[PDB]
Design a protein around this ligand. Structure first.
Ligand SMILES: *[C@@H]1O[C@H](CO)[C@@H](O)[C@H](O)[C@H]1NC(C)=O
Ligand SMILES: *[C@@H]1O[C@H](CO)[C@@H](O)[C@H](O)[C@H]1NC(C)=O
Lengths: 178, 224, 229, 228
């Protein structure tokens, strides 16, 4: 397992990531997960001109599924993201609601999978119109891309290998340093 | 067979507003027809006792006899004798209980410690504790009123009185009330009322609010 | 005649760092050299019991039998049985005791509350109450330490565990260290050592000083009248 | 041809929660009539032994027989020896494992220094450092717990106990732990558990928080005039 920069590109609010539990899921986890409209700095700051417009939104697709698997069984091994209490923040609050629904039963980024789809953050700073075909990946789609074991791997070659490839196609020791 | 009559605890006196008594007993013969009775040195008429407990299978039958007694008469400490007669034992089980005298009355000091910030930081609970210390009679009755409405005994748990470490005669007690941190931040003025004999009016209040205990962070000194 | 079996409590195992298996007898006629013994699952012989209580004036003798055992055997669920062998006793009596099992472990939350400001104004004493809440089972060993040295049990008194209203299995407790305000106005550690099974290392501490808390006290003192226009 | 005894140190005893005694044979090949038995002064070598190691091409096998004994009994210095009888060497070999009583017992004075404000200002990462000083036995074991849950030994690096020149009879050790600035500003409380023999309770904790070191008194005095 090679963790991509999901360690930082995930910009959870302080409340969920911190030790403090949440008062009510209908209002704080509600408003805090959307509180990560700050998950819109790809085209806001970094991908604004670094790459083509499509890839910036493709990176959001990666965060969304990442976000989904934080809520239920990712593979980060960290007290704030996996083996963490934020997943318990969900279970604790729903269980407080007479076990109304498991976090992996509903509210698994399925019942309210839509959120804002981070497009508000995309639009907040980048201010680039999302194509209708581009607007269905930041929201829910049936494929889960297999538990992050082969999606974060999906993202490795999308940039971390192909851009070094095109650099090579563009000293030879530095080329052989890839 | 000897009856273990219990005096009406101050908690019973103040919670029910009436002096209710019972005559629990260690018993040899499980069941007998005749029931409980209460007698006084004055020899006044016995009070009605009802709802006697059913036969105890393990032969340690315990019976309850309820009587109404004037608070002043019990306050004076005059001895009351429980008289229980049974078919097996013709001799009445004459046993007397009176509130102990000769103990100095010491006024409780009630100090309402707010929740530890280590707890409010979790934003999951806020255990307010009513620290009752310094009262000499063992009896005490702590009750919690939130926002002016009394709260059911379920919400709060009152620790049994125990001897104070430093002062031997005096006692202390605890009463923690747990409320979700959402309620605490609203500032609902959770008040603790302690009922004790030594108090001037038998009850004193101490109210803790989210604001209380906050020092003056900002000290603006505008001088022209 | 009748015998009492005393399983080692969490305080006994923790306070002495050893497991004491005492077996006392009540309602037994006094006689010299009363023999008592424990028995394990394999029935291995116990250490020669000592410190047997003398003959009480009430014609009742208490034969206390203590055997030192390794904590691993008792914490593995292995059960012990106390057997009494004496001429006075009509026949041997067997009482088996083991560690209770089936109770869900829960980590205590040691919150330490400083004394109320009202108590300080009285100038007589200060109560530093340590709140051990939300732990199961109902067996905790709360201890107080000042400057790394244990404080005498006379100063601090620990209330017995009691059920917590919010949840059935959970319990809570207390521990109040009465100290003179003079000892508290000057910063002093007053650590609350809480020992419990569920904790990662079986202990937890919470230090309190006059400094702990004390929000930043801004003292903006701005002179602005120097401007005249 | 010698047997090297491995006395599980206090760190191992605390981590594994039990005393697992092992003595390892070095530079010797396996022979018939191999004997292992933890013998004390009393001689009651009735411990179970399991998982006997097999011969190693470099003639280094453990022949390990594990046993469970009290911590305090071992602290008394029972001097367990695994008696080995081998064909090549008829004389049995003894390898005592015990605690030398000569070594003193000074409790560590564990101090938890929060991250320097020069780290937080740069705003990349904060390195909490735990300072353990004043312990005479060189058997400290430091664990870091965040939010009441132990952290993997990978996240922190505990310096080996080194001599303290200023205190001849005491050693010191540090164990830095580095977290992302976005995690330290979150307010998480990191507790430096230090496990040591000399401690009265065998364990001590120190808590470091976002607000452990704060300026308790801001004293600003703005003086705004109109002329020189
Ligand atoms: C608050 O400011 C006034 C201004 O003169 C000063 O006298 C007083 O000592 C200050 N109190 C505190 C607690 O800082
Ligand atoms: C607070 O400020 C006032 C005026 O600036 C000063 O007289 C007082 O001593 C200060 N108190 C402190 C620093 O505690």
């Amino acid at each position: 397992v090679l963790i991509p920069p999901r360690r930082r590109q995930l910009c959870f609010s302080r409340i969920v990531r911190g030790p403090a539990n949440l008062r009510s899921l209908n209002e704080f986890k509600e408003e805090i997960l959307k509180g990560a409209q700050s998950e819109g700095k790809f085209l806001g700051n970094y991908y604004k001109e670094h790459k083509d417009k499509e890839k910036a939104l493709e990176a959001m697709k990666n965060s969304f599924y990442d976000y989904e698997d934080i809520i239920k069984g990712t593979d980060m091994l960290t007290n704030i993201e996996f083996k963490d209490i934020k997943i318990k923040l969900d279970r604790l609050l729903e269980k407080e609601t007479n076990n109304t629904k498991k976090a992996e039963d509903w509210w698994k980024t399925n019942k309210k999978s839509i959120w804002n789809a981070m497009l508000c953050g995309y639009k907040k700073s980048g201010n680039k119109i999302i194509d209708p075909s581009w607007c269905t990946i930041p929201t829910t789609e049936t494929p889960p891309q297999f538990l992050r074991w082969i999606k974060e791997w999906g993202t490795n070659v999308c940039i971390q290998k192909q851009e070094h490839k095109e650099y090579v196609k563009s000293c030879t020791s530095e080329i052989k340093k890839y | 067979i000897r009856v273990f009559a219990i005096p009406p605890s101050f908690a019973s006196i103040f919670l029910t507003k009436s002096t209710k008594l019972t005559c629990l007993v260690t018993d040899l013969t499980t069941y007998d027809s005749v029931t409980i009775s209460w007698t006084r040195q004055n020899g006044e008429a016995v009070k009605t006792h009802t709802n006697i407990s059913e036969s105890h299978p393990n032969a340690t039958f315990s019976a309850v006899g309820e009587a109404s007694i004037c608070e002043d008469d019990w306050n004076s400490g005059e001895r009351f004798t429980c008289t229980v007669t049974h078919t097996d034992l013709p001799s009445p089980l004459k046993q007397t209980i009176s509130r102990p005298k000769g103990v100095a009355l010491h006024r409780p000091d009630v100090y309402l410690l707010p929740p530890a910030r280590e707890q409010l930081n979790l934003r999951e609970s806020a255990t307010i504790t009513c620290l009752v210390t310094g009262f000499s009679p063992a009896d005490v009755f702590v009750q919690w009123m939130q926002r002016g409405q009394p709260l059911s005994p379920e919400k709060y748990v009152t620790s049994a009185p125990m001897p104070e470490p430093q002062a031997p005669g005096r006692y202390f007690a605890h009463s923690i009330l747990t409320v979700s941190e959402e309620e605490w931040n609203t500032g609902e003025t959770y008040t603790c009322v302690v009922a004790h004999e030594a108090l001037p009016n038998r009850v004193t209040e101490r109210t803790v609010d989210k604001s209380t205990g906050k020092p003056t962070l900002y000290n603006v000194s505008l001088v022209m």
